[PDB]
Symmetry: D2
Subunit: 477 residues, 4 copies
């Protein structure tokens, strides 16, 4: 019997009284593991209202006390890490080891964010007026909402709530209807440690219903959403009605540039890891490789073996695999279609390229060759273990092609040449550029994508300041 999850509103779990439910299916077995309410905008309003009530008294607390609350939550996470991990594996369909780190990192991330308590600073600005003091304070926005993705559902709860709460905001989070269980568990921890009512709220439902309310409710100061570009378009358009601030993370088509002088083994590992992780279902995954011709042959051959070596299976039954299934049937069909589009445009399927037909949504690691920069596969985000490769002559070309995208979240380049590195740094129009290593953001970095990849960012000091606004005081006395 799959559990029927309640939403968490105003400091308590509230059982759903509606008739409609959303089935949460295991992407590996297609079994229904649980059901969440097919929430309505009304449910989002209640949470938003509770969030609004709590905000004043929450921001009035000294920052160190808000931090203290965050630490109780992280400690709560660690005590149930294995259990949380298992939930991620089940509904997310990600490999055990990855679920384990997500959970562990989430707790550390929260603890790290809590350390900002006594550190985000306001400023005292010199005035041209004698006897005047210009004090610029950093204040909370108020009520914030978070629309989470399914690829890293647990971490993203923290990615948004930790910085939000620390700075004195309250939040109403909507997890992805595909992966709500880990969120329910996060709520249980929040409830158990007694976090003040209304500071953290979890509503459940679809994006067109619950999500939209979290972006269109006039009481919301900022809606932080992570999802598809089109979804971000719908979210920002809605947030526009009330001039609501948006913080968007909409994916990418992260290019990887391999120079002739690249540490070939290093590059192949970084790229494969960066591409095969979570079955390529990450916004900063290496989605397109540019290999300089001089090294194309040996590199593509090495890259080919590596990927062909990537094993995939049911994460709950194997800990020797690198990939689990894709999130759902639609996702699988989406990947198959894009690969077909690639073939149709003239691309060559080295290995893989055919979705497994059977229980679950598995897609084999895929290497696409004879790809031309103009091919859709090089522009549209795949979100699957598919890797197209294009050869280039000069750095200028690689840079030019890497920049030829509506996405600008992550980029990577492997070289040992100083000038090439500096030129790539300067030329690459991306929010992130990894040099001689895999695409894994640090919690103290700034994961903010250029162009359509998003607006605003997450992590680090700047992620923290996304939840802070200013009050310039002109004191004359």
């Amino acid at each position: 019997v799959p559990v029927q999850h309640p939403m968490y509103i105003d400091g308590q779990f509230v059982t759903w009284r509606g008739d409609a439910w959303i089935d949460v299916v295991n992407p590996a077995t297609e079994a229904v593991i649980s059901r969440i309410p097919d929430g309505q905008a009304e449910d989002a309003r209640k949470a938003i209202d509770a969030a609004e009530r709590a905000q004043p008294e929450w921001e009035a607390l000294p920052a160190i006390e808000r931090a203290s609350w965050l630490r109780k939550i992280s400690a709560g996470i660690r005590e149930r890490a294995t259990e949380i991990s298992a939930l991620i594996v089940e509904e997310g369909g990600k490999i055990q080891q990855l679920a384990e780190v997500e959970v562990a990192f989430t707790a550390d991330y929260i603890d790290y964010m809590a350390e900002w308590a006594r550190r985000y600073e306001g400023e005292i600005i010199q005035s041209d007026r004698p006897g005047e003091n210009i004090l610029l304070f950093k204040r909370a926005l108020g009520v914030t909402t978070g629309i989470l993705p399914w690829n890293f559902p647990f971490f993203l709860i923290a990615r948004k709530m930790a910085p939000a709460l620390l700075t004195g905001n309250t939040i109403v989070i909507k997890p992805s209807e595909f992966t709500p269980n880990n969120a329910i568990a996060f709520a249980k921890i929040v409830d158990e440690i007694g976090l003040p009512r209304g500071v953290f709220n979890l509503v459940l439902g679809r994006g067109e219903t619950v999500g939209q309310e979290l972006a269109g409710n006039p009481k919301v100061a900022m809606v932080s959403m992570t999802g598809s570009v089109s979804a971000g378009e719908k979210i920002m358009a809605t947030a526009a009605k009330n001039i609501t601030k948006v913080c968007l993370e909409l994916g990418g088509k992260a290019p990887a540039i391999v120079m002739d002088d690249a540490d070939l083994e290093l590059a192949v590992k970084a790229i494969v890891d960066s591409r095969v992780i979570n079955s390529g279902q990450v916004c900063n995954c290496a989605e397109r490789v540019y290999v300089q011709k001089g090294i194309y042959d040996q590199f593509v051959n090495r890259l080919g073996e590596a990927m062909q070596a990537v094993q995939f299976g049911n994460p709950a039954e194997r800990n020797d695999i690198a990939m689990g299934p894709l999130i759902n049937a639609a996702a699988l069909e989406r990947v198959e279609q894009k690969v077909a589009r690639a073939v149709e445009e003239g691309a060559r399927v080295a290995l893989g390229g055919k979705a497994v037909e059977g229980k679950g949504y598995y897609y084999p690691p895929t290497l696409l060759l004879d790809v031309r920069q103009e091919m859709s596969i090089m522009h549209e985000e795949t979100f699957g273990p598919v890797l197209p490769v294009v050869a280039f002559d000069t750095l200028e070309e690689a840079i030019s092609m890497a920049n030829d995208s509506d996405y600008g979240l992550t980029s990577s380049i492997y070289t040992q040449n100083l000038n090439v590195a500096m030129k790539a740094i300067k030329g690459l129009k991306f929010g992130e550029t990894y040099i001689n290593r895999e695409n894994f953001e640090a919690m103290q970095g700034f994961h903010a994508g250029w162009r359509k990849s998003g607006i605003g960012g997450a992590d680090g000091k700047h992620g923290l300041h996304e939840y802070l606004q200013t009050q310039v005081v002109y004191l004359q006395s």
Copy 2:
């Protein structure tokens, strides 16, 4: 014969070939002073494309060289200050002295922004990985657009372009169709000093046409618009289609709090100045006064005389007036209606309250009494010399009422009590709080409004950073 202005695109003035024109009328005499093209989206695209072409080579220039270009423009402004001022007075209908400062301040503002060249810093972040360097660079967004207002048309050209160009962005500006002449003059200066083609572009037309293109063109990194809330809604909604970043300044209903222990003379002057300036046509104008009961009588009487003393006339024919006419007929009718709405709701018209019937759009300073916090006049932005006054008992009430608004740009309070001041600072949910002085932002402050007052901000370091984005480089080597 009114001059037919050409747009400034890709380093040159381009004569309009369309048949439709927009008349630019003098708000004081209703005479047509000039005509601008009824530009189309196509015209905005050409400018945007030119802006895109120039951007790479513009950002490649050392910051100090971009600054050098800004200084040539400011110097250009000063050489023609009187002429520019006259244009502002004519089309803007603002008093000579105010036009003079706008022009003078604009030049200083540009020079000030240019000084950021060698100062906006990137960051070197500690990494948890041995041998890794985390370099966070500040980069330009690329192509930015600016939709300017008519109240301070000249300054706002600089408010957006100076920080934009300094940081390496290129810009396409659309002035308000009501006040384009000063913008044309700004373009002439830009053209005369030889600013690289495509870095600064001026397109002319309506907001639903030209404005929309500047917000919806996919090549635009960020659209910076200053106008009405509803206009901001339309702009952000459009910018949403391409996940374009928005920087919005949409007005306010700036509350002014007068405590019993306030320097009465100081408060009356600050508020009147802050309210009557530009005929109350400023977003940070004192739009609603809260006077503690103990001082209500003497204060309201003093305030009454002050405002009644405010003279208004045709700015081109008098330099002894404090106000000019409102921007246009619609604006006038809007103010009359809101005052009527006030009366209808129970408000009392002390003095003024009746638009002059005749050539021009003049509205007398107006004091509204017997106002209740729930009255529309206390929520809807007036943008006219109308001043409603509400009495209150405690600070808590004044704060509560001040915060009771969809606008949160500016706020002010007059007191001599430490605790009252600190409590007001902490309690006031505004981007700006003036204490014992008039509402005039410093160029080194941060004019960023809360709630519907806007998104992002202008001026100072933070205004400058609105035009900067980040590139986090994870260097391993």
Copy 3:
């Protein structure tokens, strides 16, 4: 039998082989509680050399790993807090409750400093040269030394070592020969948790011997010393020989200004607390009070009762006292002499003013009246529970007199008037100004005294940066 303490050098406790020892006497009972080696410069060199060897590999560790080491130490402190407290009480002669907070705060302070790991930032500066990158890195100084005081011996170990180690420096600490036991205990914890050898070293001895070496050894990057002005003079003079950086905290004569409109009860409590704490043996203690005439009478009377109510005794035998004995006989005699000097100059002894004759070094709370600004008692730091009071007319006078000092560490003022506050803030030439509260620095503040009070500072971000230096890299490639 008093324990003979060994020094802690290069990761291990080393037994003293010399013949001379320093007796550590209980300031309350005059009993010998322990003995430490009468260390020689040679002993300081060994520690410095070990510190130098370890530095490279210590700074090579990721900051988060150094932080991890700090946290092990703080956790170690907490597990033995009661025991550490008891040692402080015994050798320091401070009241149990104060020893308890010192220990508790020390651990929190260390944990707080460890949180800077991923936060101290370098900077990327814009260059006037095309293709150039200016990278300003923050690096450790190298080997640093710390000469600790006896008033807050335990906390100061952390005040210097935590920020030092986090930033990648190694340190050689010399506790005060009067209070080394708590330091030995800190070393035991460091040793037990396995902190890399040479990173933390504890040498024992006198200042003219061991202390001098820690300031004059050419391998020392910076000597951080907290003590008497004359001692600081000797330390800086020595550090001069090798152009060694100094961070000095040399005490103060913290003035307290009470305005007529001050919350009298609040002021009396703040001042007494700030003065009687640790028997007035703190650099930021209220050492001189300026009371506006209008409130002089009632205030001085209230202040008098409060102080007369302050009980003092043997901290190990009573937890109902506010003060313990002074550090030693010399200290006691110093206070008696200064009070006598006060009387001789014309001062009036309200209450107290006579050192108890007997076992221990107790001095009663003392209130001095009929004091003139020029009296020595108003300039020379007392470091005893003696409180001189001077009446003044205007704020200007209070400010002027407060500033009339070679010390400029801490200052305080009690008022409810905005202007008085702002004028005091602006006029007071001090590193710290408390307004309507007692003089207790926050760990996130910046305890850095002006004038002779010191050079550099402690605590917060700026305290942390005292242990960091810069490396500006001009990269052309």
Copy 4:
């Protein structure tokens, strides 16, 4: 007839009444060009007192107004640039072109520093106490003194006074007795533009007399001195008596590392330029070269020709030379001795190595080979056009040897390898590291040397903050 210069004290030039004078001799012709007073400590006190009187009212001025004063001075410099240049050439003995840039850069430097007016920020720190505000203000130190060097006498006036005055400090400057004329000219400009009396003061005399007073006068907040290490030792030791803050720039032995993969032509030019500039009389001059063996031969040969091509002469009579004479006879003899010491230790004199015997103090460019790392010539600063070269095997060795010095101001390395660069950056313990370019600091960088090279620094934001201190306000209200 050589002019007898007066000192500039308290807003006016004061004629010397003493009997003793110091002859200012032209290093190229040995002719007496002028005479300055053999000032006494008393003269320094008068200036310091005037500086103290003016300080309060100077700091009370809005920062932008202080900046305005700086700009008047820079503009004054430019109007007399040629004349100032000529003076530098005459007394400094530097080539016309270098004197010209010094003057031009000085003016730009001052203008740049003035731009900090509205930019140095204080901070608002979060407190653990409810209702408390922690405001950290940046205040001036008060009275500061500057002991200038003779190598870049004009620039250093600005390097110290510009940041000092902008932040609200007043200053008393002592130029080098060898090069006071340019300082007198700077004073004339200051006097002509009407800078408030006492804000800028110029005293003349020797270091043991006037200099010492500027470091030992108890009214001095900070003494900023640039000179020899031993002089810095005497200055800091003196400043110690009153716990006066010191900012010292004491020279260097800047190492240059040439890797096998270095752009040989680029490296030879950078190093020669960096070494031959001002006849090698600069603290950041390349003073020792480390060439990897693989490229040693071709590099040393190229380097040899380059240096042999460096022409030197009387700067007033030739504009085709790269070097002028050394500052004075003692300097010349010092260089000859050090070269002899090199030869005696086993070094080989490729070319030059023999001071010209005749009118003036000329020393030919000198290349020393067969140098061993332990040779004095590789440790003692030469301050002459002498260049020792050592061969090395690995980067590790070059780094190790570069770090083997009491000086740590500047360092440089030429390579095209990413890892080598990053390793050099990380390994080089210097305040500056130039990569593939000559050693010329940017005004927005931070010229602060490690180890004995100095304490504190100059230029940029951090140079500016050397003249700023903090006042942490704990506001409770």
